[PDB]
Design a protein around this nucleic acid. Structure first.
Ligand SMILES: [K+]
Ligand SMILES: [Mg+2]
Ligand SMILES: [Mg+2]
Ligand SMILES: [Mg+2]
Ligand SMILES: [Mg+2]
Ligand SMILES: [Mg+2]
Ligand SMILES: [Mg+2]
Ligand SMILES: [Mg+2]
Ligand SMILES: [Mg+2]
Ligand SMILES: [Mg+2]
Ligand SMILES: [Mg+2]
Ligand SMILES: [Mg+2]
Ligand SMILES: [Mg+2]
Ligand SMILES: [Mg+2]
Length: 95
RNA sequence: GGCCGUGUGCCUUGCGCCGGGAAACCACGCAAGGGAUGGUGUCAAAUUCGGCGAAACCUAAGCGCCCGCCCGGGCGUAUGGCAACGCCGAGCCAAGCUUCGCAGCCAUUGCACUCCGGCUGCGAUGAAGGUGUAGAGACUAGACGGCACCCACCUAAGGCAAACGCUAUGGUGAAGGCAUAGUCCAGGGAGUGGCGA
RNA sequence: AAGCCACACAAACCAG
RNA sequence: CAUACGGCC
């Protein structure tokens, strides 16, 4: 379902075969139509595989991303999005 | 093939010893013997270039002594040389391991911000051990070699235990592979030709 | 000298 | 005990 608003969004249920360095650019171009993107974290580890965190400059870029991109097929797989349960280390150094 | 001897590598015993180790025991220095040194699989590849050392042993230019002197000689000696062998820089290497890529399958629906699941497959780099290092050398093979286990003996740090204590990822079960076993091919056996003293 | 290098070469044997 | 060296068979 949904959680409570955040600067960063939690993306899961991805295709686990797409490589780290390739996927970043496939995310930096597709989501930049909501606003500016700060950083995209992707790990291929057993725990973090098929998961991605996308950090925007403002909430407006992330809130619309939750609605406009909910269910979008990405490499023949549905894209599930939730709000982040924590604030990113990239964000914590400013506030 | 045997018997005596010298050297060097070896192990055992009985000595020394601010080294490492928790102990076993390893390493170090020497001296006297040859009684002893467990097992099964696996790996067979690279085998290039270039420097550093050696004992006995063989020989005697130079130099020393001597045959009173020269002419010959004689005696000592390595600094010359053979060579068991001890090793250094660079390049390459099989399987087993450290770490990385890509592919393949099995898992995994997982909230991270430091990196990270397991296999089998090539390719890659790490640390061993090789190789260079045979009588110039060519080639087969397993071993005394690299590797995983297996067994006997010793110790027990850590882990286990209330506890006498249990337990090996720690020791001990030699060195030989500067060619070991083989089959070749140098070499001597057995010729002249230089160089050398 | 001991030994080294080049060419030539018959055996069993010795042969790292 | 192994390698190599000096003798001897
Ligand atoms: K000690
Ligand atoms: Mg014996
Ligand atoms: Mg070959
Ligand atoms: Mg003289
Ligand atoms: Mg004279
Ligand atoms: Mg003499
Ligand atoms: Mg000498
Ligand atoms: Mg050499
Ligand atoms: Mg060789
Ligand atoms: Mg060898
Ligand atoms: Mg041989
Ligand atoms: Mg001859
Ligand atoms: Mg030899
Ligand atoms: Mg030998």
């Amino acid at each position: 379902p949904e959680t409570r608003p955040n600067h960063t969004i939690y993306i899961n249920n991805l295709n686990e075969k797409i490589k780290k360095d390739e996927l970043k650019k496939s995310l930096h171009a597709i989501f930049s139509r909501f606003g500016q993107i700060l950083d995209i974290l992707v790990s291929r580890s057993l725990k973090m595989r098929g998961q991605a965190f996308v950090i925007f400059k403002e909430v407006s870029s992330a809130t619309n991303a939750l609605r406009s991109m909910q269910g979008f097929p990405f490499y023949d797989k549905p894209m599930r999005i939730q709000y982040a349960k924590t604030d990113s280390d990239i964000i914590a150094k400013m506030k």
